[PDB]
């Protein structure tokens, strides 16, 4: 209830300072400019390193959402499983991690 | 009267924050460029006065045309001078962005940046030392500071 | 301990400017402090400064007047309020005031 | 993120020098060459002043030829710390920008002493120098002097061994020898590949026949033997430097031929003949004969040269202007096939290019 | 009489290969160079105060042009176009008569300070030392036309830093 | 054996710390004589209410008051 | 009562973010043998303010934009995320006391890179956009590291309190058992606000450079709104100072000025490198830190099963 | 020299210590002088809860010793 109330005075002290910073000096009549870039109207190329390198986060990132409940479960009574199952996430973290170094898929953002 | 007063002291406040947080663009034509980074060097060192160097034009105040403006390149610095946000300020640095200098009758030199820029500022020498730079910063600084925008708005 | 010594001289800067008012005119018209030894003083009030010291470059320098040809210039001072008989001095053109 | 094609346009700093140059004297030319490469002023002074001195049959005094070597030197260090600060600013370190800007602001006293411009002097001159050095400035030299190797020593503190630096140069701008020589390279950017040549020693001018110095070669032609080279050669400037200190003879300052270099002012006023040779000196200007030259010198560059044909009048015909940033800048593509964005802006670093000579 | 930057070959006994990979591992170099920066930042700096305190300058300095005038107030020109035939930039332009006492004197002398390039050949070639570059270099102003110099202009430099000129010239004429 | 550990500690001395942290992280639990304090300290931790028990009659093992001498204790966690 | 916390909490954040402006340009003025500002106020002292009103002042572009929507949602959510990260942060005592205020800081910053990615779209420019986009793909490279090693961390706290990780810290900083995790999470932090020598938006244009003095002082100060945030995360996170709870200000000093050193560091290390290749820090991270950070994280694992040390989950 | 940078980084380090002993004095008073309860857990706010409830003036940091029993 106090965390919606420092979230929504957060938005509302940044949204005010936005709207100040947007308009004023929307007050002032400076001058109409007409105005008529390293790329001049050519289409972007796609860049297929950059999605492999946003995908590769989106797999490590889930093998990460797979290793977070660590601190808890290291309070367990089965600990031999447990650790068995903790090392065998981050090895697999490494498996893919080695697939893709000896794959080449790490190279040119190595 | 009372309000002429409240825009007198809104004029001395803008113009304070406007004069002692001058932003130029890092960007050299010439053999001013070099004097220029001695005034960003630190003997002279330009940001203790407030004075950044800046990559871009749109974080950008003044624009420190130094060195020969030749005719290949006249509507790239006018492009610069038009991405910039008002108030923008020009210093035209060294004989050749005043008048053309040591290349004044050639076929390729614009005979001063003031045919394709408006000019605030002109520094002379050929370069000014870094001194005269700073000193033609802080003359900008005193013309910034002497400006009256409130006062003509709240007499207009 | 020698930062007893940097305090000690820091107070005695405050105390080599005519007090608290001196310090702080100086500090806001000057953005500096030291105190030096003074060399001399035109017919328009700059007051110029040795401390030999300090290093080549700050071992002169001028307080600039602060009313010079009917303009205030306790503000607004201007590296060209320098008569030209003081110009070389304070540009180290030569040894002598 | 690979370079395939780099395609430097120029002719922004194209300002038509050599074309104003053949409407003017010689004297009058000669401050158009402090002009064209701003961080090595009186190099190429010194370069314009031995091709009319070679078309002219006339040597510089000795004296003058050691005042030349010396701000030649100091000349070098000015070019090689606006080359490797830049060279890293642009690369990202820029703090060794501003610790080396300091000295190099005491060099530019030293020229402001000796000429009274902090950069264009217009201080060597055909037949000389202008004005023999003031009192005391070969004491404030010796000062600087002393206290420089501990600069380059926290500079080099700074780079060498430091590995953000070494992945930034040492796979990049890769030139072999022979396309090093194919191209027309000169300098750093010949002796970045092995090549052992340098026209202070090969072909030399005016006292470095009696300088002893050496000549840092690098190994593999990358930007960080380039680097390292220009270092070294700032190293061997300071060694130079010291020995022209040392070695600096009595004597004049201008070639005592009056009908090229100007009287003095004392003699002006009291001789008809000396009055007679600086009227017409500094009217006409001296008549050079007709002839057609091409002098180099080792400039910080590179081989900066000088195609002078007089044809026999007090101004100059033709006067082309060979700079080393040139064919650098055309060699450019080639150094940068197959490297990425970020490693050409750090080719165009080790490259050191000044538009004021590629444009002229 | 020529040397090798870059032919070291690293030793490859276990004592340098562990130093450096203590050296990778480790981040010594790094540790160097944030050393070396925290050695600048208690050293003393060496920003001079400027309008207050000046960067040193010679007596060969050349900032602002001047006419001067002799120690009786004629003015030293006699219009003889020496100055205007040596000018690199043609930034001396200078017309002349014959005014009422006979005297060879000018009735133009103008100097653009922004064709100028404050190279000094002016006061080098000049018989009588009456066009000299002073010692002001701090003369920037807000338009174009107020550094396009005329003859009063420059007189008036003259009388303003004569006596500063007379002082440089005489620390500084029997070098030339 | 030495040659090729020499070769990758002077080229990838990242991985060499990498694969030997991993190592013994991997084999230094089944060596360690303090891996058993762990289970039994995480076993000891009361997270739930030791339910009692009623008695039957005979179990003499079973405590009938929480300082009675019998049940489980944790001296060898009050002194490891 | 509530309301004059939060507003404590966060108008200081600003003026902190506002002079510390002053202090990189002095540190870094100083350390590059010159001055930093010393004219505007006494000390520099004004030159925050004075830099701030002149931006404010600026005429804005407000450019042909892919999406207006976007281009005023990137400022507006940079602060929002910039000032939400702190109210878990206990110093000694936090705004919000949350038992997951680890993962919900690891979340928050994790929603920091739409920022980039909607000030890339809104510039029409397309090497913005590319710009943007590698720095995206950065920041999202260095949240790897910083989860996993953070999360190796909180092996050794027991739990996702931090409070809790003031109370683990009370004989010994946790960077001695940790510090190759505290030297990749203090490099990882420092390449997650695109900060040298991990910065790409000064040289090859950033992702920012369409805005100009309206929005881009806010970007700016969200920006070091998270830098020493993050500092004063680590200084958490393995410089946890003594807490007396009968007098917190002790607590507070010491971490003040622990996170003050931090955020001065970074300063000093930004003075005293080049840049990477952009390659050169994907290369960082993906064959150098992950494979230690995996390593270690698997150290972290076992060695409290190992060693009898398994944290309290209370 | 380089003692110019303390006055900013004072200044600074006072804006910092603003929120920290901001929010320790407005925890104690918004408590009865004391601590804040922390609640993370179910028990914990159970006790909260009942502590409020024992308190009779809707407060849980109202405590409640020997003297409330006979
Ligand atoms: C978050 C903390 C910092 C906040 C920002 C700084 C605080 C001060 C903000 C208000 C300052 C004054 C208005 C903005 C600056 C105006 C500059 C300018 O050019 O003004 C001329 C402008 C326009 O004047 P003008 O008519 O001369 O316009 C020039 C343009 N031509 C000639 C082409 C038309 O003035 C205004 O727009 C007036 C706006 C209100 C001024 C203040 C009123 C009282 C406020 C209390
Ligand atoms: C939180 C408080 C502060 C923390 C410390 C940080 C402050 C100092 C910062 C200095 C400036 C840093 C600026 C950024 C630098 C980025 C570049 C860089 O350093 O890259 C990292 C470099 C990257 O390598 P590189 O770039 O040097 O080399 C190139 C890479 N190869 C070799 C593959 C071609 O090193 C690392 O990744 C090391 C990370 C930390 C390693 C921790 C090792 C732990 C040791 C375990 C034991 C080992 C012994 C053997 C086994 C024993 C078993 C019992
Ligand atoms: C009814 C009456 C009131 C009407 C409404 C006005 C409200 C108050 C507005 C602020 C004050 C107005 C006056 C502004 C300054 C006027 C005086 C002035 O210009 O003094 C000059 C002097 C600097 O002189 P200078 O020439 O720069 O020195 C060169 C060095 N030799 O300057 C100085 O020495 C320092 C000047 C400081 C200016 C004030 C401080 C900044 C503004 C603070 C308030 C606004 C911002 C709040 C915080 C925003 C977020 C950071
Ligand atoms: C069993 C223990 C647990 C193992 C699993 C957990 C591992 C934790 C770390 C995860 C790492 C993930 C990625 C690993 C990829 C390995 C393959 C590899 O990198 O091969 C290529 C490399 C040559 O490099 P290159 O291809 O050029 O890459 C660019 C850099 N130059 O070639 C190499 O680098 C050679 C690599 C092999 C030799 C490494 C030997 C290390 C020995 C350390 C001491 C003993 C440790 C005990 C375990 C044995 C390990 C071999
Ligand atoms: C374009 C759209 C606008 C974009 C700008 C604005 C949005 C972005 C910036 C704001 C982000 C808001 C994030 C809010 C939730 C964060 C997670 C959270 O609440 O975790 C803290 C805590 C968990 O800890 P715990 O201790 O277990 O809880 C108390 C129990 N003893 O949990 C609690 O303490 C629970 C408290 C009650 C429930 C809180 C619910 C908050 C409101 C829901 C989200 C609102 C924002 C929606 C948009 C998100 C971004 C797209
Ligand atoms: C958590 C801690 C946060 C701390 C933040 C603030 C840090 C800096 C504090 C202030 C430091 C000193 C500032 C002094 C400014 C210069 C004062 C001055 O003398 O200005 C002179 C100017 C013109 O004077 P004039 O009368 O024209 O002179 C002719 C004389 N014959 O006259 C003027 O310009 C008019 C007077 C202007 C005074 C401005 C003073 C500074 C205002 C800053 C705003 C914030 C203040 C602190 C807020 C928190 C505490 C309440
Ligand atoms: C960033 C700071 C503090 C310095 C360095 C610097 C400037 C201002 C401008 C420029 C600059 O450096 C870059 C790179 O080096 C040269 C060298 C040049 O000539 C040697 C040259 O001539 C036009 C231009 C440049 C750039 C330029 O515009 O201030
Ligand atoms: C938040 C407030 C109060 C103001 C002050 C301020 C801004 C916005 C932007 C900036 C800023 O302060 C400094 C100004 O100077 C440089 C100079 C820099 O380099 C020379 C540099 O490099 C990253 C960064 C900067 C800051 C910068 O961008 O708003
Ligand atoms: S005014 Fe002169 S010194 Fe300056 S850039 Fe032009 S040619 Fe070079
Ligand atoms: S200094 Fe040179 S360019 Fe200037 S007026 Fe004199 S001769 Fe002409
Ligand atoms: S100033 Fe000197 S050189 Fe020029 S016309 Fe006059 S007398 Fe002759």
Not at chain 5, 127 to 155: C, M, Q, R, W
Not at chain 7, 225 to 249: Q, R
């Amino acid at each position: 209830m106090n965390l919606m109330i420092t979230l929504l005075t957060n938005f509302t002290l940044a949204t005010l300072l936005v709207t100040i910073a947007f308009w004023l000096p929307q007050l002032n009549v400076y001058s109409e400019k007409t105005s008529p870039d390293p790329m001049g109207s050519a289409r972007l190329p796609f860049s297929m390193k950059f999605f492999l390198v946003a995908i590769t986060f989106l797999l490590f990132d889930l093998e990460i959402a797979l290793l977070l409940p660590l601190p808890w479960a290291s309070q367990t009574t089965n600990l031999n499983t447990m650790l068995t199952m903790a090392l065998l996430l981050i090895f697999l973290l490494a498996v893919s991690l080695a697939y893709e170094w000896t794959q080449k898929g790490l190279e040119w953002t190595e | 009267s009372r309000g002429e007063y409240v825009v007198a002291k809104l004029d001395d406040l803008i113009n304070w924050a406007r004069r002692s947080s001058l932003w130029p663009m890092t960007f050299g034509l010439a053999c001013c460029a070099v004097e220029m980074m001695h005034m960003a060097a630190p003997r002279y060192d330009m940001d203790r006065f407030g004075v950044v160097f800046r990559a871009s034009p749109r974080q950008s105040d003044v624009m420190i045309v130094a060195g020969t403006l030749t005719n290949k390149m006249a509507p790239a610095l006018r492009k610069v001078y038009d991405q910039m946000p008002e108030p923008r300020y020009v210093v035209s640095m060294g004989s050749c962005a005043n008048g053309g200098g040591y290349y004044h009758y050639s076929y390729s030199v614009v005979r001063g940046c003031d045919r394709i820029v408006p000019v605030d500022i002109y520094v002379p020498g050929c370069p000014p030392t870094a001194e005269a730079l700073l000193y033609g910063i802080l003359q900008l600084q005193k013309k910034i500071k002497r400006e009256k925008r409130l006062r003509i708005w709240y007499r207009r | 301990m020698e930062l007893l010594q940097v305090l000690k001289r820091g107070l005695q800067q405050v105390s080599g400017h005519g007090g608290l008012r001196g310090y702080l005119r100086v500090l806001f018209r000057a953005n500096d402090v030291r105190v030096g030894t003074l060399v001399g003083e035109d017919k328009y009030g700059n007051k110029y400064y040795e401390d030999n010291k300090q290093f080549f470059g700050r071992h002169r320098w001028v307080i600039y007047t602060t009313e010079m040809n009917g303009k205030n210039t306790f503000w607004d001072v201007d590296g060209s309020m320098v008569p030209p008989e003081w110009h070389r001095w304070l540009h180290c053109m030569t040894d002598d005031p | 993120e690979m370079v395939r094609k780099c395609d430097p346009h120029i002719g922004l700093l194209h300002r038509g020098t050599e074309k104003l140059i053949e409407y003017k004297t010689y004297l009058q030319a000669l401050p158009y060459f402090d002009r064209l490469d701003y961080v090595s002023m009186m190099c190429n002074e010194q370069a314009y002043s031995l091709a009319v001195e070679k078309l002219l049959n006339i040597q510089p005094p000795p004296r003058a030829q050691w005042i030349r070597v010396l701000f030649g030197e100091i000349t070098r260090l000015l070019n090689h710390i606006m080359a490797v600060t830049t060279h890293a600013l642009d690369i990202g370190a820029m703090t060794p920008f501003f610790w080396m800007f300091e000295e190099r602001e005491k060099m530019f006293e030293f020229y402001e002493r000796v000429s009274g411009a902090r950069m264009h002097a217009a201080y060597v001159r055909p037949g000389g120098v202008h004005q023999d050095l003031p009192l005391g400035l070969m004491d404030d030299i010796y000062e600087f002097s002393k206290n420089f190797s501990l600069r380059i020593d926290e500079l080099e503190e700074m780079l060498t061994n430091n590995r953000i630096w070494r992945n930034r140069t040492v796979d990049i701008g890769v030139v072999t020898a022979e396309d090093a020589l194919n191209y027309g390279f000169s300098g750093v950017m010949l002796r970045g590949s092995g090549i052992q040549w340098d026209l202070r020693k090969t072909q030399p001018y005016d006292v470095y026949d009696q300088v002893e110095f050496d000549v840092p070669i690098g190994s593999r032609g990358d930007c960080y033997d380039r680097y390292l080279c220009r270092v070294e050669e700032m190293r061997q400037s300071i060694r130079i430097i010291s020995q022209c200190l040392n070695k600096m003879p009595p004597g004049e300052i201008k070639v005592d031929d009056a009908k090229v270099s100007p009287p003095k002012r004392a003699e002006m006023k009291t001789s008809m003949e000396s009055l007679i040779h600086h009227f017409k000196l500094y009217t006409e200007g001296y008549q050079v004969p007709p002839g057609a030259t091409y002098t180099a010198i080792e400039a910080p560059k590179g081989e900066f040269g000088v195609y002078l044909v007089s044809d026999g009048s007090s101004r100059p015909y033709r006067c082309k202007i060979k700079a080393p940033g040139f064919a650098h800048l055309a060699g450019l593509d080639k150094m940068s096939k197959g490297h990425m964005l970020a490693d050409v802006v750090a080719i165009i670093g080790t490259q050191d290019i000044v538009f004021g000579e590629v444009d002229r | 009489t020529y040397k090798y930057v870059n032919l070291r070959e690293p030793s490859m006994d276990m004592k340098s290969v562990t130093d450096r990979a203590a050296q990778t591992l480790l981040w010594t170099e790094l540790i160097r160079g944030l050393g070396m920066t925290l050695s600048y930042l208690f050293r003393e700096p060496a920003t001079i105060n400027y309008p207050f305190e000046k960067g040193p300058l010679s007596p060969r300095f050349r900032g602002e042009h001047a006419l001067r005038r002799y120690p009786s107030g004629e003015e030293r020109c006699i219009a003889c176009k020496l100055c205007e035939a040596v000018c690199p930039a043609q930034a001396i332009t200078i017309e002349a008569e014959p005014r009422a006492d006979g005297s060879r004197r000018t009735t133009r002398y103008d100097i653009d300070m922004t064709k100028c390039i404050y190279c000094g050949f002016c006061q080098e070639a000049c018989p009588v030392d009456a066009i000299v570059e002073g010692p002001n270099f701090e003369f920037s102003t807000e338009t174009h036309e107020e550094l396009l110099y005329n003859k009063e202009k420059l007189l008036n430099n003259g009388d303003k830093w004569e006596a500063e000129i007379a002082a440089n010239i005489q620390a500084d004429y029997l070098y030339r | 054996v030495a040659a090729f550990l020499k070769n990758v500690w002077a080229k990838e001395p990242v991985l060499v710390a990498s694969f030997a942290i991993a190592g013994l992280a991997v084999i230094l639990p089944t060596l360690s004589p303090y891996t058993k304090y762990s289970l039994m300290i995480n076993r000891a931790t009361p997270y739930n209410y030791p339910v009692p028990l009623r008695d039957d009659g005979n179990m003499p093992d079973v405590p009938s008051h929480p300082q009675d001498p019998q049940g489980p204790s944790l001296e060898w966690l009050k002194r490891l | 009562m509530f309301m004059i916390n939060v507003l404590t909490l966060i108008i200081p954040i600003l003026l902190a973010v506002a002079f510390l402006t002053l202090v990189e340009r002095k540190v870094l003025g100083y350390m590059q043998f010159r001055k930093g500002p010393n004219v505007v106020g006494p000390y520099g002292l004004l030159q925050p303010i004075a830099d701030a009103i002149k931006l404010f002042i600026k005429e804005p572009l407000r450019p042909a934009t892919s999406s207006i929507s976007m281009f005023i949602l990137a400022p507006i959510l940079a602060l929002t995320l910039a000032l939400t990260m702190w109210i878990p942060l206990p110093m000694p005592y936090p705004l919000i006391n949350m038992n997951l205020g680890v993962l919900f800081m690891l979340a928050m910053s994790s929603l920091a890179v739409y920022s980039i990615l909607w000030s890339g779209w809104a510039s029409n420019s397309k090497y913005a956009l590319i710009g943007a986009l590698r720095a995206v793909a950065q920041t999202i490279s260095y949240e790897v590291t910083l989860a996993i090693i953070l999360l190796s961390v909180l092996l050794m706290n027991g739990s996702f309190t931090l409070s809790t990780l003031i109370i683990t810290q009370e004989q010994v900083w946790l960077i001695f058992p940790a510090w190759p995790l505290a030297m990749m999470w203090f490099i990882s932090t420092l390449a997650e606000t695109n900060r040298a020598p991990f910065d790409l938006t000064e040289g090859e244009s950033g992702f920012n450079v369409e805005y100009a003095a309206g929005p881009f002082a806010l970007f700016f100060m969200a920006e070091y709104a998270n830098i020493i945030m993050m500092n004063i995360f680590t200084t958490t996170l393995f410089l946890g100072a003594f807490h007396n709870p009968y007098m917190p200000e002790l607590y507070t000093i010491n971490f003040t000025i622990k996170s003050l050193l931090l955020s001065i560091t970074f300063l000093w290390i930004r003075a005293s490198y080049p840049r990477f290749r952009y390659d050169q820090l994907m290369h960082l991270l993906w064959k150098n830190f992950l494979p230690l950070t995996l390593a270690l994280c698997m150290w972290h694992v076992s060695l409290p099963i190992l060693l009898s040390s398994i944290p309290p989950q209370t | 020299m380089w003692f110019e940078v303390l006055p900013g980084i004072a200044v600074m380090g006072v804006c910092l210590f603003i929120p920290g002993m901001a929010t320790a004095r407005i925890h104690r008073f918004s408590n009865g002088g004391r601590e804040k309860r922390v609640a993370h857990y179910s028990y914990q706010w159970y006790l909260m809860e009942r502590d409020r409830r024992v308190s009779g003036v809707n407060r849980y940091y109202v405590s409640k010793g020997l003297e409330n029993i006979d």
